[PDB]
Design a binder for this molecule. Structure first.
Ligand SMILES: *[C@@H]1O[C@H](CO)[C@@H](O[C@@H]2O[C@H](CO)[C@@H](O)[C@H](O)[C@H]2NC(C)=O)[C@H](O[C@@H]2O[C@@H](C)[C@@H](O)[C@@H](O)[C@@H]2O)[C@H]1NC(C)=O
Ligand SMILES: *[C@@H]1O[C@H](CO)[C@@H](O[C@@H]2O[C@H](CO)[C@@H](O)[C@H](O)[C@H]2NC(C)=O)[C@H](O)[C@H]1NC(C)=O
Ligand code: NAG
Lengths: 390, 200, 391
């Protein structure tokens, strides 16, 4: 009866996004899916080529459709024969590609999902959710924008059949999950499900205990769409404080790599930043970035950049090794991007921000926790904080 | 240490023909008489000035608790000039119904301990707790009519995210199944069972 | 025919608001009214003892109603007999209590208004606008929030029948008015209408000349509602910058609340930055509307530089610690900025306390605001003695 589950995740060098192999179906097999922090459910593309002895499409008005919060019936208008993802009198579920923001109507599906438990300091045997609920999406939906070979997304949002909500309930876990993304495409990061301060789990998490003791917390707020928000009162650069702008104003997301700022905030922040740097070290901006420098000249010193949080109780310090990006050869760019004038939020913290940080989503106390010193100052990385070896 | 079956004894009220249960809540633990409402979306209690608990909390608006309960409407206490359980500002509002009178009222989302019997061999076992059980603190008028004598709210077993069984299933990792055996007689109890009844 | 007009104004100690006696009607009498910088018009309670041989209520669709920009007709549902404020076939005008944010439908009115001219260096004879347009507002509107016995408001906003616009057009004045509010309830400040740089007015403004030479200017922008805005790029505290994120300025100027109001995120960040540039061991229990208070005995000569960095960093409005520190209580000194919450009208709203003991010139012809670059006291002057305000 496990108290902690582990899902290894990987960075895609090309897109800067993260993905995981999820074990599903009978016989059990691996499905590469995009990591979508705010996604409402797991979805995968389904076809006549889907093979599983435990697959079911729940009937409309079933208890399964009720739990998934869909009461719109499904009618298959593609195949003229039934197949996974294609039946009549089933229920419909709207799935979204968070990258392209395309969406499509899928069919609610039910099957086996498996995930690692722990055994001492190592990964333990796979444990199963035999009736995991998810969406069978139309094939086109994943055909654009995702890492290569990825065929859906696993969603961890605040919504009734999110992945964590189904794992919590099936195994009776504490309502908490922790994200430790690895910045390197060559080594895995992880997501952990359950209580990490649980003496039973002391053996697996023993190596991270110093990091956990020094965790700093800030209130977590949730939008009506199930997204994760925190409150940022200012972005501080040395002694200059940029004041952005109840739900927090900063979105946390995994579906774009770099941090996106609304146009008014972007313009103010990038100039303030330029004012705290040698003004004639700048070079023509490269890539998606607006303020770029020559690498040899600025190794001198980058300024202090901190997110001042809700009630100013807490500070999320951002390392210059995080927010400086090596756009080119000998060009390092300030890794914040302009979200334009119809940006979804004022600040959206992306994957790059999250990488090499341990971030705990404590749903039970409605707060987010993070390491108050760098992982590297503990002699750790997101790849080796926990044993992710077979 | 995790029970595979939980049991809630229920009793018939002769006068009204309805069924109710004493539910254990709060720290220190105490009993609240509540109506059995099979289709009810959540558990609600009239919460008073004299509500005593060291584990009580009112989740803040836009919190994860308010998300789970599926309410994003913020609550403003238009009543007291001081706070009490059921009366705060910047919490979230939840609509509760009296299923007998079909009255409804806007309550405040609440969090506290709930306890319920597990089983031990062939007998009832020790009480086990849900330390952060989510429920509604409902306006007082809502229980004043239609209910058995001294009953102060209702427990709902409906298909909804913070129904009683839904929270018990997920806290303890139970099989998603519950069983009802109501007793005809006011003089002996029936029960509700949560979990798998078929693993002899 | 005058080139300069003067309206003395007084601070109300209790509310921190400012009010003036306006002379109106035939025979002329004084009406105490709230000073509302952004108010769209002058309004009064008329249901009273309104006695005047010069009163009129313009008819609906009249030329007076067009000028006032109201094309909505008025129907009286109170008295069933006629009086000031109560007719049928008149026009309706919405008036607002800027303190309570209440509004009510009033009736457009016309009567005599009078105001002081100047004679040499002193106040001169009253001159009249015989058909001054204003609103007879419902009685409830003035029953709450105003200084005691104040019965309406005079508005100086950017709107067609504002007080200053009607004075400008009647007398052919330059479109400029100047505000010098007094900090003290025991002596008056003033509003001046017309060009202060007009050699014809040299004798009246002679005593203020050192101040005028050092005036600093910043662009003025006006909202769709007729409010006065300037652009504050940052608030500087010693070497810390609190930086807010063809547009209207971000800082409102108003007379209808005493203290400077900051939207919540700014208030939060600014107050802490302030607390960080102060002795933490000097703080005391917070008092009143304030968030950061000190024991007055410490702190003495220990407050930091607080400056508004203005549009395009061309200018600075340095704020004195005798202005931004408030004496909440016997021996308690508070930082005089208050939290406007998360749905504030503006990020920054500079209020009556900010304006007090400064000369602030609203130059409408060039769309700019000017202010003293050194404190009035450094000239040996106050807002009460900059100009001769003895009748
Ligand atoms: C799902 O329900 C649809 C509506 O009942 C089915 O379509 C219907 O097929 C009838 C048989 O030829 C035809 O008379 C109806 O007009 C038609 N209805 C519509 C709205 O087009 C559908 O059946 C499949 O698709 C149709 C177009 C034919 O090829 C059928 O032979 C197919 O079974 C149902 N799909 C299923 C049961 O998989
Ligand atoms: C909840 O908030 C309301 C509104 O902010 C409070 O009601 C007001 O209290 C202020 C005192 O600061 C009064 O001036 C208002 O007249 C009140 N408004 C109303 C509509 O009554 C209320 O006190 C708060 N309740 C609690 C328990 O804090
Ligand atoms: C206004 O018109 C109504 C409706 O004709 C009438 O009853 C009322 O007496 C009129 N008011 C006055 C002051 O004459």
């Amino acid at each position: 009866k496990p108290n902690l589950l582990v899902l290894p995740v990987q960075e895609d060098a090309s897109t800067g996004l993260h993905w995981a192999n999820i074990h599903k179906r009978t016989p059990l097999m691996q499905v590469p899916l995009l990591l979508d922090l705010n996604g409402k459910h797991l979805w995968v593309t389904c076809s006549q080529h889907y093979s599983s002895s435990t697959y079911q499409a729940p009937f409309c008005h079933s208890t399964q459709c009720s739990r998934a919060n869909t009461h719109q019936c499904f009618t298959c208008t593609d195949s003229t024969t039934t197949r996974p993802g294609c039946h009549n009198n089933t229920c419909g579920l709207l799935s979204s590609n968070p990258v392209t923001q395309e969406s499509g109507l899928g069919e609610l599906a039910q099957d086996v999902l498996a995930i690692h438990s722990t055994h001492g300091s190592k990964l333990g045997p796979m444990v199963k959710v035999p009736q995991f609920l998810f969406s069978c999406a139309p094939s086109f939906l994943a055909q654009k924008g995702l890492p290569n070979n990825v065929q859906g997304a696993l969603g961890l949002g605040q919504a009734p059949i999110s992945l964590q909500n189904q794992l919590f309930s099936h195994f009776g876990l504490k309502r908490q999950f922790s994200v430790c993304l690895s910045r390197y495409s060559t080594s895995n990061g992880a997501i952990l499900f359950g209580d990490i301060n649980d003496p039973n789990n002391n053996n697996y998490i023993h190596n991270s205990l110093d990091v956990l003791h020094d965790l700093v917390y800030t209130p977590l707020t949730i939008s009506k769409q199930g997204e994760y928000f925190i409150q940022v009162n200012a972005i501080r650069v040395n002694k200059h404080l940029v004041i952005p702008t109840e739900i927090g104003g900063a979105l946390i997301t995994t579906t774009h790599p770099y941090t996106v700022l609304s146009h008014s905030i972007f313009e103010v922040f990038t100039q303030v930043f330029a004012n705290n740097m040698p003004k004639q070290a700048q070079v023509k901006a490269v890539g998606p970035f607006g303020l770029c420098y020559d690498s040899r000249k600025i190794s001198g010193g980058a300024p202090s950049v901190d997110l001042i949080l809700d009630k100013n109780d807490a500070v999320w310090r951002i390392s210059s090794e995080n927010f400086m990006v090596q756009a080119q050869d000998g060009v390092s760019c300030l890794g914040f991007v302009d979200g334009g004038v119809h940006a979804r939020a004022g600040i959206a913290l992306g994957a790059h921000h999250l990488e090499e940080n341990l971030v705990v989503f404590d749903l039970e106390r409605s707060r987010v926790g993070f390491n108050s010193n760098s992982l590297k100052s503990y002699g750790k990385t997101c790849s080796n904080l926990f044993d992710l070896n077979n | 240490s995790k029970p595979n079956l939980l049991v809630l004894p229920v009793q018939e009220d002769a006068s009204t023909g309805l069924h109710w249960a004493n539910i254990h809540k709060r720290t220190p633990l105490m009993q609240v008489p509540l109506l059995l409402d099979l289709n009810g979306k959540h558990l609600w209690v009239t919460c008073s000035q004299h509500y005593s608990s060291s584990t009580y909390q009112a989740p803040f608006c836009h919190s994860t608790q308010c998300s789970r309960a599926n309410t994003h409407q913020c609550f403003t206490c238009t009543d007291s000039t001081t706070t009490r359980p059921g009366c705060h500002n910047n919490t979230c509002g939840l609509l509760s119904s009296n299923p007998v009178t079909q009255e409804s009222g806007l309550g405040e989302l609440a969090q506290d301990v709930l306890a319920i019997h597990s089983t031990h061999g062939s007998k009832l076992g020790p009480m086990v707790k849900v330390p952060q059980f989510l429920f509604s603190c409902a306006p007082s008028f809502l229980a004043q009519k239609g209910l058995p004598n001294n009953v102060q709210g209702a427990l709902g077993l409906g298909q909804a995210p913070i129904s009683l069984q839904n929270q018990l299933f997920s806290h303890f990792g139970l099989k998603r199944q519950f069983s009802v055996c109501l007793s005809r007689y006011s003089t002996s109890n029936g029960a509700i069972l949560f979990g798998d009844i078929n693993d002899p």
